[PDB]
């Protein structure tokens, strides 16, 4: 009736992701250096091409 | 060669009369079929009885369509044993269950003109039911006139 593990649940399973936060900040640094292109919604890419 | 009666329940709205006959006519010949429906409003009670000519094909259909997830309904396909078959169970089989507007009949009967003495029956019924109601509310106390 109960789980086999009595170990505590890590707080990471209740808060937003930290790996994605680091990835998003790396992307923000890349956009600020102009290395990568920013976000354009798909209808803009369709009417451009 | 005895017929096999089949009880099908948890019917989705749509699997009523001709769809049942066609779909289980793919499974074999059907002698009779009847969907139980309400008296007051013409509407299925999600329940039906289908009589096939062959008992083995009835067992096959009930076995392979028993726990079928159809339109959010898990069906109930169970073969009624030959000893437990009620005699006049397919009384309204192979017939349409017509939707009859009972309340519209009641309203247009309320509209309907009574001629001379049925209004005397009207006021007689009115007066002694008022008398009984008067006894009931004189038990607690509330006076009325007219």
């Amino acid at each position: 009736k109960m789980p086999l593990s009595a170990a505590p649940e890590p707080k990471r399973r209740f808060i937003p992701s930290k790996n994605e936060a680091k990835q998003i900040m790396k992307l923000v640094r890349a956009i600020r250096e102009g290395r990568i292109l920013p976000y354009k919604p798909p209808e803009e890419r369709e009417r451009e091409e | 060669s005895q017929p096999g009666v089949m009880y099908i329940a948890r019917l989705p709205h749509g699997f009523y009369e001709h769809e049942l006959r066609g779909y289980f006519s793919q499974f074999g010949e059907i002698t009779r079929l009847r969907v139980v429906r309400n008296k007051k409003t013409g509407a299925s009670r999600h329940r039906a009885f289908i009589e096939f000519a062959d008992a083995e094909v009835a067992d096959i259909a009930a076995r392979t369509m028993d726990k079928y997830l159809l339109f959010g309904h898990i069906l109930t396909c169970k073969i009624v044993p030959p000893a437990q078959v009620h005699p006049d169970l397919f009384k309204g089989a192979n017939r349409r269950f017509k939707v009859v507007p009972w309340n519209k009949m009641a309203g247009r009967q309320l509209e309907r003109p009574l001629s001379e003495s049925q209004w005397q029956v009207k006021v007689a019924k009115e007066e002694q039911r008022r008398a009984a109601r008067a006894e009931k509310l004189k038990e607690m106390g509330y006076e009325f006139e007219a």
Partner: protein, 148 residues
């Protein structure tokens, strides 16, 4: 029943690499110029086993053609012991297409969005009325033989 289960699991597929990078680029430029927990189909053998053991999984779909079959023989008994409804499906490649991989030995669903919780419940009941009791007597018996 496999079609119904795959309709629900196709509603809850994970995201591909392109959608993940596209979404992350969207958040990056939104930061340049609020969310709830994502709900997906859970996959991976060790991850799904850990979900079953902790009674987090709600429905488990096990592939039937795992070539080292030892990786999944204990799984029906484990689901029976912990009380999670399970079903054996045809094709690890089918479960693979669902999770954007070539194959998937087992998938599990734990929790869903509100708008189809009832549907998940019905599906669970469906398998536990449509597969678990048809297996209940033959799950214990030896198979095969050339008697005749």
């Amino acid at each position: 029943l496999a079609a119904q289960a795959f309709k629900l699991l196709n509603k809850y597929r994970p995201e591909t690499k392109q959608e993940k990078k596209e979404r992350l680029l969207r958040e990056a430029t939104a930061i340049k110029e609020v969310s709830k927990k994502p709900y997906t189909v859970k996959y991976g053998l060790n991850h799904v086993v850990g979900l079953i053991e902790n009674k987090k999984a709600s429905l488990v779909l096990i592939a039937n053609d795992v070539d080292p079959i030892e990786l999944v023989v204990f799984l029906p008994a484990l689901c029976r012991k912990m009380g999670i409804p399970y079903a054996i499906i045809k094709g690890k490649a089918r479960l693979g297409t669902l999770v954007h991989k070539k194959t998937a030995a087992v998938v599990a669903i734990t929790e869903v969005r509100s708008e189809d919780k009832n549907e998940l419940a019905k599906l669970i009941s469906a398998v536990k009325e449509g597969y678990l009791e048809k297996v209940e007597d033959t799950r214990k018996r030896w198979g095969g033989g050339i008697m005749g």
